[PDB]
Ligand binder design. Structure first.
Ligand SMILES: CC(=O)SCCNC(=O)CCNC(=O)[C@H](O)C(C)(C)COP(=O)(O)OP(=O)(O)OC[C@H]1O[C@@H](n2cnc3c(N)ncnc32)[C@H](O)[C@@H]1OP(=O)(O)O
Ligand SMILES: CC(=O)SCCNC(=O)CCNC(=O)[C@H](O)C(C)(C)COP(=O)(O)OP(=O)(O)OC[C@H]1O[C@@H](n2cnc3c(N)ncnc32)[C@H](O)[C@@H]1OP(=O)(O)O
Ligand SMILES: [K+]
Ligand SMILES: [K+]
Lengths: 176, 176
């Protein structure tokens, strides 16, 4: 069965092309309730398109006290990975989680998250967090299934790259 | 009169103790309108207390392509400074702006912001941004007077440091 383990220098050249692309078919619409500052959302369909999530240099995460990469291995091949760092607020921060396109929805991502939680706890980190865009509904639903909640959002940060679009950053948190 | 110029190595030992403390006397209460995703706020008084804004190592900002420190000089003394970097979204990012307590409300901060805008433009940066806490109403009003608008907020990021309090991060933006 599937194995999740820490990335090693010797894995760097055996690292295959992993398809991190996904289909954007909808977007989250955010709202702020007056009850417990709860950020809520509704889903709105948008004309579909494909995009790649992704600079990430794997070697920068090998042999480091506060950052690490875990890889998912199935039938002698790396089929997914998770990139983690310790953030300024003490939480573990997911820089990137990717499962090869052909193997998604089969529980690999949840197993990567479970390992990330172990790493966070081993380092005395009180939770895990990450940022995603409101047009990555697949990822949003995945984090929600994993126990994460929306703690914040930002309507202007993406304008610095492109002023035409209306991409929104969403910040997700899982507290232990 | 006042002089604003780039920090030099030779200024490092002539750098005096600058009082960056401020009095917290209120906090911003955020809301999200349905019109143009406008984030609004109201001010609520809170029992007052003093806190220091501030690791920042000035030497890390000397002789760098994408980061810099400008100092404010008055009567042979450094009375304020602004710390800037280029962010991932291309905006100039204010890591810290401080005017010595005794000289506040006399226009020094606005002059530091003006210089930061020049630096941003010289580097082809499309705007300037920063993060502050909802309990720093003085800073919030100052940014608002300087033309900044609220682009986002986060209710959980501060929980990683302290779970008892309810500090909220506010992200401000000035687009050119
Ligand atoms: C910080 C960041 O990295 S943000 C970017 C995240 N990465 C990407 O978007 C790259 C492309 N996407 C992917 O690689 C994958 O879709 C991942 C990593 C997000 C998820 O990995 P997967 O292995 O597919 O997730 P997994 O099968 O473990 O799903 C776990 C749960 O989430 C749910 N889920 C997963 N994908 C979806 C989806 N597209 N829509 C709805 N629910 C979903 C599953 O149904 C499952 O729920 P359950 O526990 O109730 O059965
Ligand atoms: C990213 C970060 O650094 S967030 C932390 C910001 N830094 C701090 O909080 C450190 C402590 N505070 C300070 O150092 C100063 O208060 C600063 C840097 C925020 C502002 O510097 P100052 O030199 O006092 O500001 P300056 O006098 O230029 O004020 C410019 C405008 O803002 C307004 N303003 C300044 N302080 C306040 C205040 N406390 N309340 C209301 N309005 C204010 C001024 O009235 C002025 O408005 P005008 O142009 O309409 O006359
Ligand atoms: K995303
Ligand atoms: K602040």
């Amino acid at each position: 069965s599937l194995l999740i383990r820490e990335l090693e220098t010797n894995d760097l050249d055996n690292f295959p092309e992993i398809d991190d692309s996904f289909i954007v078919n909808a977007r989250l619409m955010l709202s702020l309730s007056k009850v417990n500052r709860r950020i809520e959302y509704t889903v709105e369909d948008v004309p579909s398109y494909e995009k790649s999530y992704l600079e990430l240099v794997y070697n920068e995460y090998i042999n480091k006290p506060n950052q690490i990469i875990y890889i998912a291995l199935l039938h002698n091949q790396i089929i997914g990975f998770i990139v983690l760092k310790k953030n300024w607020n003490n939480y573990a921060y997911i820089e990137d989680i990717t499962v090869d396109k052909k193997y998604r929805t089969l529980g690999v991502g949840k197993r990567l998250i479970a390992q990330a939680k172990q790493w966070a706890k081993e380092g005395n980190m009180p939770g895990i967090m990450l940022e995603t865009q409101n047009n990555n509904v697949a990822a949003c639903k995945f984090y929600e299934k994993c126990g994460f909640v929306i703690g914040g959002f930002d309507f202007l940060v993406y304008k610095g790259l492109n002023m035409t679009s209306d991409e929104v950053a969403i910040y997700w948190y899982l507290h232990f």
